[PDB]
């Protein structure tokens, strides 16, 4: 089935992935250079025998997301076992905090991996349109330059040398929850860093596709009349933290209570993954509630590939319309929430997506518990795993090493599923597809 064209393009893709592998070598990294050479050798062999070209698509997207860990695990066989090495590779590789437990160059590369993950997911997300020309590189480059420079300068202001500021900036590009010390922010807390970072957290993760018109000259920014529901949820979050603080009369001083408390609530809630508290001053229900908060994740046109405001909003508001149906079946219902009359075509797939999603959720919970894992620690772990924050706070045994390596592979596939659309893998397994 036109194997020459596929072979040459795929080889070029592996070589291209390999080119961006010289990052440790800047810090005087032989295996990474070796990976570039081996893949380049792959591209060269594919390229020279075949000169032909084609012009299925789903195979290409699956294949594109297949390459990311074909050369992310070689330098690790850090002396640790092969399954653990693969798992750790994926842990560093994915934007996840899969801690079970380094060289300066390798650590820099790991943060760099976060940088690579940070930009790759967004470009692919915008790019999905032909199945459902490269000029977007410059505009994304300007916006990205603004984001990175702002973070670095912001760190620099709070009394530190530029290298440390840049190091922290690299660490926060795609937020795993990692820092210099496994304590997310306890080791270093200057108030300016905390306030500035929280501002960064709110602005950075909700919506940039909307502001893509910011690249055009026209100023279309006054757009107040995604916004109303989202602010209601976050403000409600602030009020509940205020109520909890008043009920347990924890801190009398406003700055520590508001900044630390607000910081913890927002950071755990926004799926950032920066956690420095073990929720004792909070009741036990607060970890459970926060975990449910963790389930919400991503805004439309954002890095977070989770449940979104539009989907749940559609279910509840459309559900409200359904409530109206309960009142009378002889009543026509057509309602448009904002900009325009919504079609009944796309909307069924949103909750059919949710239903299938729930089926997947059942598979993940049942499988992870079933493989031999503990009922509760794994239970917290699966909730955390789907979200991609880190290991389960409830009944903490966050660092699992003695868990089944095959289950560890399942954990890798599960977290990857959390980042990716899960279905992409699913279409291959379905009978009659073949």
């Amino acid at each position: 089935m036109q194997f020459r064209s596929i072979i040459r393009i795929v080889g070029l893709l592996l070589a291209l992935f390999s080119v961006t592998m010289l990052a440790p070598a800047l810090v005087a990294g032989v295996p990474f250079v070796t990976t570039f050479f081996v893949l380049l050798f792959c591209g060269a062999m594919c390229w020279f025998p075949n000169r032909r070209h084609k012009h299925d698509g789903f195979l290409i997207v699956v294949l594109f997301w297949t390459v990311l860990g074909s050369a992310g695990s070689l330098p690790f066989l850090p002396n640790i076992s092969v399954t653990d090495a693969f798992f750790e590779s994926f842990s560093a590789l994915t934007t996840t905090g899969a801690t079970v437990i380094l060289p300066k160059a390798i650590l820099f590369y790991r943060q760099f991996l976060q940088w690579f993950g940070g930009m790759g997911i967004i470009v692919l997300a915008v790019a999905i349109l032909p199945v459902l020309i490269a000029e977007t590189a410059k505009a994304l480059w300007y916006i990205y330059l603004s984001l990175t420079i702002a973070c670095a300068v912001a760190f620099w202001l709070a009394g530190m040398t530029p290298f440390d500021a840049i190091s922290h900036s690299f660490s926060t590009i795609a937020i795993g929850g990692f820092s210099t010390h496994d304590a997310s922010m306890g080791y270093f807390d200057s108030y300016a860093i905390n306030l500035i970072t929280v501002v960064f957290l709110l602005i950075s993760a909700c919506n940039f596709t909307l502001h893509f018109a910011a690249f055009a000259s026209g100023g279309v920014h006054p757009k107040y009349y995604e916004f109303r529901a989202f602010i209601f949820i976050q403000v409600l979050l602030f009020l509940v933290c205020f109520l909890l603080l008043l009920k347990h009369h924890s801190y009398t001083s406003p700055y520590d209570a508001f900044d630390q408390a607000l910081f913890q609530t927002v950071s755990i809630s926004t799926t950032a993954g920066f956690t420095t508290t073990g929720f004792a001053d909070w009741p036990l229900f607060l970890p459970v509630l926060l975990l449910f908060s963790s389930f919400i994740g991503g805004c439309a046109g954002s890095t977070g590939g989770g449940m979104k405001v539009i989907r749940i909003l559609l279910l509840t508001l459309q559900g409200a319309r359904e409530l109206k149906r309960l009142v009378h079946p002889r009543a026509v219902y057509t309602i448009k929430v904002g900009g325009s009359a919504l079609p009944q075509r796309v909307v069924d797939a949103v909750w059919g997506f949710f239903s299938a999603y729930a089926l997947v959720f059942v598979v993940c919970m049942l499988g992870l518990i079933a493989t031999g894992m503990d009922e509760l620690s794994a239970f917290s772990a699966v909730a955390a795993t789907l979200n991609n924050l880190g290991p389960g706070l409830g009944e903490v045994a966050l660092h699992f090493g003695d868990v089944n390596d095959k289950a560890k592979w399942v954990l890798i596939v599960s977290m990857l599923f959390g980042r990716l659309e899960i279905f992409t893998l699913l279409i291959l397994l379905t009978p009659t597809f073949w």
């Binding site: 002889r330 009543a331 026509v332 057509t334 448009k336 009359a341």
Partner: protein, 234 residues
């Protein structure tokens, strides 16, 4: 009041019939003046320089439009009313007519029927309170069902009591029937009053029925003449 009616079809003729009298001088053009309604001489022969109103109700919008243009440009004929059947033209009514390019001058609410002037009055009163649009038809409704907003649409049969009694007819302040074939409308309204409806608004197409509605139990009548003749006769 000097009136020229272009085209003596059902609409032009019936208009002419309603209107004959002491304070009105009616001239009708049709191919009385025999000629093409938008020709300068035909229009001149109907006395467009002196007339106080046109009414263009020929077979064609393009002739109506041409008549109003020709009359305005050549004789400055005031108050030019024209029938335009094409939604395409009305879609640009602001830019085409209302600019003078084409010189044409012209708690629970419940409406049953989709009248155009009643879409207008209905558009004037839906801001204050929500309006139940109920319409008999399906094909006229399924397009409309997300076409207009600030109004609540429904369907149901007018004669079918199981629909009007269904929805607590005591809980609704008005009954507004836009349906044609008015007699039915007259009787249904009586029936509507019998069921306990508070206010019954009835579509009654001809003005000349004032003597026929005068001794009526029907508590408000509605004629399209009292408005559409008034924009000219005011």
């Amino acid at each position: 009041m000097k009136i020229i009616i272009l085209g003596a079809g059902q609409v032009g003729g019936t208009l002419a019939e309603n209107l004959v009298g002491e304070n009105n001088d009616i001239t009708i053009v049709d191919n009385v003046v025999n000629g093409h309604a938008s020709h300068p001489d035909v229009l001149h022969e109907a006395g467009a320089q002196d007339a106080d109103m046109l009414v263009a109700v020929t077979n064609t919008d393009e002739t109506n439009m041409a008549a109003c243009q020709v009359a305005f440009t050549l004789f400055n004929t005031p108050n030019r009313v024209a029938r335009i059947r094409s939604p395409e033209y009305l879609a640009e009514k602001e830019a085409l007519f209302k600019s003078g390019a084409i010189p044409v001058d012209h708690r629970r609410i419940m409406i049953v029927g989709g009248g155009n002037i009643g879409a207008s009055l209905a558009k004037r009163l839906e801001q204050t309170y929500s309006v139940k649009l109920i319409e008999r038809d399906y094909q006229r409704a399924e397009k409309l069902s997300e076409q207009l907003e600030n109004t609540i649409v429904f369907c149901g049969d007018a004669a079918d009591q199981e629909l009007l009694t269904e929805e607590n007819i005591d809980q609704v302040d008005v009954f507004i029937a836009l349906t044609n074939e008015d007699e039915t409308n007259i009787m249904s309204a009586m029936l509507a009053k019998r069921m306990g409806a508070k206010k019954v608004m009835v579509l009654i197409q001809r003005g000349a029925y004032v003597d026929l509605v005068q001794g009526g139990v029907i508590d408000v009548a509605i004629s399209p003449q009292q408005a559409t003749i008034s924009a000219l006769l005011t």
